[PDB]
Amino acid sequence: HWGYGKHNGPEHWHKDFPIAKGERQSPVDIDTHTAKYDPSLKPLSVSYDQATSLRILNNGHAFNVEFDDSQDKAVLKGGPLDGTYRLIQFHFHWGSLDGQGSEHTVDKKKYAAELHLVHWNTKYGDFCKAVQQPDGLAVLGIFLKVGSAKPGLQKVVDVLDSIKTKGKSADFTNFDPRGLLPESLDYWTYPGSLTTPPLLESVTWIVLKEPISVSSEQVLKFRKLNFNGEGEPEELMVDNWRPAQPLKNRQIKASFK
């Protein structure tokens, strides 16, 4: 029953998920002047050449593009990470207006949307075990600004009509997530959590400094999705983002000088 409305939104989540008020919750504001360059960080390696997309699903909170994670086909390594993290899915969070929609903020700036590429640590064997571990997941976060169109997003945009309502899925094979990345892999990193219930404190966040540009027409099509199921009253899928949470006893590290 959790969601993003007045009556089931982020201010209510703590009543069923008490970890909502925990010590390593996400997202956070990234204060760029306070974040410190870390020389101990190794080079970040995004290896998506053999990625195998399968399906796209409207789950009632966002849409997920799902991948075959039964082998090391699309992996994230290096940076703050020990070992190999396998891509399982990506999704977005976005706003009702271009001035909001991101989960992380940068010096309090909100972007129009945020892309999350979700990976699990292969030392734990599957996602279900990994999500219960403090180093179980790595989420690569990428900001979206409204400007020129992102060509590699268009195949996602054009399938959204077929998954308008909660519980609808469609085939989504042969999609290359490399087309969603910016040029630079400069990043900030900190230990955090899932940004939706169950809000588990199992995520190493890696947030790219360079946003990608998407067109107004592209984000407008995100906003035509529905939170509701088929034949229920229409509630547009907009503002599916959690606001920034207290940083508490954490340091945000930068990969770049």
Ligand X SMILES: Nc1ccc(/N=N/c2ccc(S(N)(=O)=O)cc2)cc1
Binding positions are: 91, 93, 116, 195-196
Quickly tell me which residue has 């969601």 as its tokens. 3
Strand, coil or helix: 155:
helix
CB 57 within 8 A of CB 64: yes
Least distance from ligand X to the Cβ atom of residue 196, Å: 4
185-224 footprint of ligand X as x/- string (CB under 6 A): ---------xxx-x--------------------------
Strand, coil or helix: 217:
helix
Q: C-alpha distances in angstroms, 9 versus 51, 79, 175, 187, 199?
A: 34, 33, 32, 29, 13
First-to-last alpha carbon distance for the chain, in angstroms, is: 44
Closest C-alpha among 212, 219, 31, 4 to residue 109: 31
Q: Which residues are annotated as a binding site for substrate?
A: 195-196
Least distance from ligand X to the Cβ atom of residue 202, Å: 9
Distance CA 239, CA 103 (A): 10
Query: Could you say whether residue 108 binds ligand X (CB under 6 A)?
Result: no
Catalytic residue positions, numbered = 61
Least distance from Zn ion to the Cβ atom of residue 37, Å: 27
Q: Which residues are annotated as a binding site for Zn(2+)?
A: 91, 93, 116
Q: How many CB atoms lie within 10 A of CB 42?
A: 12
Quickly tell me which residue has 């699309």 as its tokens. 74
Query: Could you say whether residue 244 binds ligand X (CB under 6 A)?
Result: no
Query: Could you say whether residue 16 binds ligand X (CB under 6 A)?
Result: yes
Query: Could you say whether residue 110 binds Zn ion (CB under 5 A)?
Result: no
Q: C-alpha distances in angstroms, 243 versus 27, 93, 103, 204?
A: 7, 11, 6, 18
Query: Could you say whether residue 251 binds ligand X (CB under 6 A)?
Result: no
Distance CA 228, CA 2 (A): 13
The entry of Zn ion, ligand X, none near residue 15 (CB within 5 to 8 angstroms by kind) is ligand X
In this chain, which of 110, 116, 150, 242 binds Zn ion, going by CB under 5 A?
116
Query: Could you say whether residue 24 binds Zn ion (CB under 5 A)?
Result: no
In this chain, which of 6, 7, 36, 108 binds ligand X, going by CB under 6 A?
7
Least distance from ligand X to the Cβ atom of residue 198, Å: 6
- Among the listed ranges 5-13, 28-36, 69-77, 249-257, the one in contact with ligand X (CB under 6 A) is 5-13
Residues in contact with Zn ion by the rule CB under 5 A: 116
Residues in contact with ligand X by the rule CB under 6 A: 1-2, 7-8, 12-13, 15-16, 116, 118, 131, 139, 194-196, 198
